[PDB]
Ligand binder design. Structure first.
Ligand code: NI
Length: 341
């Protein structure tokens, strides 16, 4: 059944709760972002109001064929009334169109649901600074101190320099980047930009990217693989067998592949810097795993929470085991005692 951490008390609202059938009592279904664990269950047959960002609304219409009459897009940073309750959507710094939701309950309680986010000090100057938040429904994906990772900017610098050097040394090398969802577009766009190429991709992925309101996107992406030297493939195909096969398909236009797998965290993060990453190589194929995260590090999450000072924290990730739940609750207490709230 629908878990309590997907229900907003004092409202008829749920968040990211589309795979339980009809949630009894639910008058409005919010969707924080277009990732499959969150939208699982939506389709053209859904007949309840869905509230979301503009970009998530484009993807619901165009990729899932949800009917327009049930899609209710809200602008960001704007006080809106939904079934008599004031709400605000904020940028979550996750994938395109991903939002956090501020609920102002009729009784005076204020609730923030982060959806999926990567906490950032810029959030300390949004509409969150303007009033107290009593309850926080928190993206705890990486809520443990082993999870460090570099800034997004450092990771893109590494990828740009690596690609540029490889292709300038060998003009017959192909760059491949893996993907299995929206997000992490900066990886492949920034590489294609330094190389003066467009990124080539399948028709289905091209359609997905045209839903994202990215400025000048017609200038950066294409479905013509032949004119492109940065290809996007399913993440499943980013391995030596899948890459050798793809190389055959290019007809001897290329003799070398340099591939990027933008992973979340991998245990080389506890030992190795970004400056010191190396690929896996077999023959003329090299694969780089790069730690490009769209979730908070442990320290970024801790700062955000110690700044916000909520009265109650409700984790939405890693909640399935007692040992995980109990460990997170221990960090939350440390944070509160260190900061004095
Ligand atoms: Ni997500």
């Amino acid at each position: 059944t629908c878990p309590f951490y997907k229900k907003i008390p004092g409202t008829g609202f749920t968040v990211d709760a589309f795979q339980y059938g009809v949630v009894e009592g639910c008058t409005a279904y919010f969707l924080t972002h277009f990732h499959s664990d969150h939208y699982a269950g939506l389709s053209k047959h859904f007949t309840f109001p869905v509230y979301c960002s503009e970009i998530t609304g484009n993807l619901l219409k165009n990729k899932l064929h949800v009917q327009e009459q049930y899609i209710h897009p809200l602008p960001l940073d704007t006080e809106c009334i939904v079934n008599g309750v004031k709400v605000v959507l904020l940028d979550a710094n996750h994938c395109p169109g991903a939002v956090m939701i501020l609920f102002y309950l009729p009784n005076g309680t204020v609730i923030l649901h982060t959806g999926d986010f990567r906490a950032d000090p810029s959030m300390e100057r949004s509409l969150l600074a303007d009033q107290k938040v009593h309850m926080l429904y928190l993206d705890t994906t990486y809520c443990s101190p082993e999870y460090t990772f570099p800034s997004q900017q450092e990771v893109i610098r590494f990828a740009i320099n690596t690609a540029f050097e490889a292709v300038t040394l060998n003009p017959h090398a192909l760059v491949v980047c893996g993907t299995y969802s929206i997000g992490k577009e900066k990886v492949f766009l920034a590489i294609a930009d330094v190389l003066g190429s467009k990124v080539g991709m399948s028709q289905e992925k091209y359609k997905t990217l045209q839903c994202l309101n990215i400025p000048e996107i017609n200038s950066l992406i294409t479905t013509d693989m032949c004119s492109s030297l940065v290809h996007l493939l399913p993440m499943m195909q980013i391995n030596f067998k899948g890459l050798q096969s793809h190389l055959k398909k290019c007809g001897g236009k290329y003799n070398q592949i340099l591939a990027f797998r933008p992973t979340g965290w991998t245990h080389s993060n506890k030992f190795t810097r970004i400056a010191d990453v190396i690929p896996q190589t077999k023959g003329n194929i090299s694969i780089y795993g790069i730690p490009y995260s769209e979730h908070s590090s442990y320290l970024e999450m801790k700062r955000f929470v110690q700044w916000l000072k909520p009265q109650k924290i409700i984790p939405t990730v890693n909640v399935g085991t007692w040992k995980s739940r109990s460990t997170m609750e221990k960090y939350f207490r440390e944070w509160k005692l260190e900061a004095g709230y």
